[PDB]
Design an enzyme around this catalytic site. Structure first.
Site, PDB file in Angstrom:
ATOM      1  N   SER A  26       2.991  -4.116   2.856  1.00 43.67           N
ATOM      2  CA  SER A  26       3.237  -4.772   4.024  1.00 43.67           C
ATOM      3  C   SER A  26       2.042  -5.729   4.349  1.00 43.67           C
ATOM      4  CB  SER A  26       4.021  -3.688   4.734  1.00 43.67           C
ATOM      5  OG  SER A  26       5.292  -3.108   4.525  1.00 43.67           O
ATOM      6  N   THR A  27       0.769  -5.063   3.498  1.00 48.44           N
ATOM      7  CA  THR A  27      -0.740  -5.145   4.186  1.00 48.44           C
ATOM      8  C   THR A  27      -0.942  -6.242   4.046  1.00 48.44           C
ATOM      9  OG1 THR A  27      -1.664  -4.871   2.323  1.00 48.44           O
ATOM     10  CG2 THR A  27      -1.788  -3.034   3.431  1.00 48.44           C
TER      11      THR A  27
END
Ligand SMILES: CCN1CCN(C(=O)N[C@@H](C(=O)N[C@H](C=O)[C@@H]2N[C@@H](C(=O)O)C(C)(C)S2)c2ccccc2)C(=O)C1=O
EC number: 3.4.16.4
Length: 517
Positions: free
Chosen positions: A248-249
């Site tokens: 998700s980064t």
């Protein structure tokens, strides 16, 4: 015939260059040591002295004598390398015929484990073999000298004639690392590992304006002044060598590609109901599944894989790939550390749907923590990527505009909401300042080929501050935390908070959470 006299030359060892931190604090220092050697032929004429010499060297008397007896045809052998000159005077004071002294150098690392992976370590011959010592070995090594002598037919030096070539000292190197921040990072990453029962971690801090690595720490670490334990896993500079799927980064990069497409603005809506989305045999799933309409900011706050996938389908994977590539994910850092891992950004001519979605939410690519930090740096630096440096940068090179300033500034603002909004990553908040960033949590890939591990995770947080004029970017990666709470927002975000709080104040960065004028 033979050689009544014999002209020989011997290497004069050169002093290895001092390594400092960016403020001049010493990190690797060449230490004069005494190496004892002997001429067995000469030793053969004073056998009565051997047992005292063996005792002084902590050697068994018979084993020592066997060693000399067997090497009797030779003219040079080490007895012991690298003793303190005080230890060396002890054995020299025995006055054993055939026993001689050379001044060598050995490194001392005053900060020890705190900066071990970054500074690195030298081998038995004072050559770099990890970290900066290896990467800058030719700068730091200088050039040995050449001394001309005469030797008899049984190996004894008869006179020093002259220095035919003077040893040339290696040169000083100032790192980009600030030891004050390095200590802070080291301590907080250690504490977090221990508090979570985690297996490993990394933490990188970068100056968004200069490209400088201000701190780089990993756990586990080791004491490079301890040349005995030889523990290869604790020696891994994980931040540069151990790749992972960023999860998700990377969503902020997918969003940058969405805003640059012409097709998306932050107030546009995606329907993410019912929390899953079927693509042939694969199902995209969100962890939290009580949403329908989310705006783009909300997609980031809730961290919806489904939402980012729908955006990806609309804009196409090519746009996303390009952003990721341009910010340096899976790309050579230029840092030139042998053994640095580049990872992998996949590419297709025709992207299938599953590859498109997973790329957008951070799977099917492998990055390093340094890469991730550099990508966040570019985003924080209004979309301009400045080349990474592990050495102090006095004159900053031109950066490359990789994301438009307007898009990067919009994305900044969204990451500030990720931290500050209701339902966001509140543990990443930095009291006194506006901070910005993105949590991630990834299942680790299974080691026996295949798929993914059920019970094993990596916890991530990436961010920068202060939001209103970014200075520092940071990445915190913690591998296999062991408590019930394993999400990035729980495990990694509080490390970011603590380390950003100290780092900003160490750098005298003015607090920006102020009234409106
Ligand atoms: C390609 C196949 N494959 C591989 C692995 N995989 C995956 O590991 N999924 C994780 C995920 O969805 N992580 C997202 C971004 O990291 C979200 N952000 C996290 C955060 O903000 O901390 C979150 C709030 C916990 S969920 C996940 C799943 C379960 C629990 C926690 C995290 C996939 O999904 C996936 O399909």
């Amino acid at each position: 015939q033979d050689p009544a006299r014999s002209v020989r030359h011997i290497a004069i060892p050169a002093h290895r260059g001092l390594i400092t931190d960016r403020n001049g604090e010493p990190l690797a220092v060449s230490t004069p040591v005494t190496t004892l050697w002997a001429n067995p032929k000469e030793l053969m004429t004073a056998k009565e002295r051997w047992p005292q010499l063996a005792a002084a060297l902590g050697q068994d008397t018979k084993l020592f004598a066997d060693r000399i007896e067997q090497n009797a045809e030779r003219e040079f052998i080490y007895l012991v390398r690298g003793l303190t000159p005080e230890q060396g005077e002890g054995v020299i004071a025995l006055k054993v015929p055939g026993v001689y002294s050379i001044e060598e150098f050995r490194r001392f690392y005053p900060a020890g484990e705190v900066v071990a992976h970054a500074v690195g370590f030298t081998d038995v011959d004072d050559r770099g073999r990890e970290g900066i010592e290896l990467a800058f070995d030719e700068w730091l090594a200088g050039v040995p000298g050449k001394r001309q002598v005469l030797k008899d037919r049984r190996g004894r030096v008869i006179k020093d004639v002259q220095v035919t070539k003077n040893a040339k000292p290696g040169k000083t190197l100032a790192l980009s690392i600030d030891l004050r921040l390095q200590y802070l990072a080291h301590r907080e990453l250690r504490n977090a590992l221990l508090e979570n029962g985690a297996k490993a971690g990394s933490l990188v801090i970068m100056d968004v304006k200069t490209g400088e690595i201000l701190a780089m720490t990993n756990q586990p670490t080791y004491n490079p002044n301890n040349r005995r334990n030889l523990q290869p896993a604790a020696m891994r500079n994980r931040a540069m060598i151990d790749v992972f799927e960023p999860g998700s980064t990377v969503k902020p990069f997918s969003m940058s590609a969405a805003l640059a497409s012409g097709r998306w603005k932050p107030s546009d809506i995606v329907d993410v109901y019912p929390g899953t989305l079927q693509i042939g045999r694969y199902t995209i799933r969100d962890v939290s599944r009580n949403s329908r309409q989310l705006d783009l900011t909300g997609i980031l706050i809730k961290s919806s894989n489904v939402g980012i996938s729908k955006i990806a389908f609309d804009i196409g994977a090519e746009s996303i790939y390009s952003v990721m590539q341009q910010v340096g994910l899976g790309q050579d850092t230029g840092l030139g550390f042998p053994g640095e891992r580049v990872g992998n950004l996949p590419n297709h001519r025709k992207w299938p749907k599953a590859e498109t979605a997973t790329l957008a939410y951070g799977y099917g690519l492998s990055v390093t923590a340094i890469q991730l930090a550099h990508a966040y740096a570019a985003l924080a630096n209004d979309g301009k990527s400045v080349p990474l440096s592990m050495t102090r940068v006095d004159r900053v090179p031109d950066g490359v505009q990789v994301i438009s300033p307007e898009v990067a500034s919009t994305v900044q603002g969204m990451l500030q909401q990720v931290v500050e909004a209701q339902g966001g990553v509140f543990r990443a908040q930095v009291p006194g300042y506006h901070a910005a960033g993105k949590s991630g949590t990834a299942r680790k890939v299974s080691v026996g080929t295949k798929g993914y591990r059920e019970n094993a995770y990596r916890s991530l947080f990436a961010g920068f501050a202060p939001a209103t004029d970014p200075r520092i970017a940071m990445v915190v990666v913690i591998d296999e935390p062991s408590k019930a709470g394993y999400f990035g927002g729980l495990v990694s975000a509080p490390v970011f908070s603590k380390v950003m709080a100290g780092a900003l104040r160490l750098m005298n960065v003015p607090p920006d959470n102020l009234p409106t004028a």
